[PDB]
Symmetry: none
Subunit: 79 residues, 2 copies
């Protein structure tokens, strides 16, 4: 009994051992991938945002140049 | 020594697993914290981006209105 019981105990522990190491490896992989994918988006978004700020600043610059034109075209027209 | 061998191996595995179980638990727990934090950041950024796009839209409207208005003053001069 004692020997065989220890054998059954040993069989279970090894099976659970493998299952466990296998599963933790898979889940850790997925968690990691997810975090990687998210870190990438965050990164690409920051880049996208910088490009947007620039597009805005340039539009505003064109807009402020148009203001000068407008004001002068009116002053012209009184002629 | 084949019953001392099993009691030895078994008790070894039996605690190694207790180890893994406890360790992964905390690790996964932290993985989930990160993932959530990153998703929340992506959302906050998306919102901020949204706000910026609105501001950009108002400005673009103002600039186009100016354009139009200008074309006019340049015709009210072309005769």
């Amino acid at each position: 009994c004692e020997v065989d019981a220890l054998k059954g105990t040993n069989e279970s522990l090894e099976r659970q051992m493998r299952e466990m190491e296998e599963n933790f490896a898979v889940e850790a992989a997925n968690y990691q991938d997810t975090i990687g994918r998210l870190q990438d988006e965050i990164q690409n978004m920051k880049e996208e945002m910088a490009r947007h700020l620039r597009e805005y600043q340039d539009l505003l610059n064109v807009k402020m140049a148009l203001d000068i034109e407008i004001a002068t075209y009116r002053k012209l027209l009184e002629g």
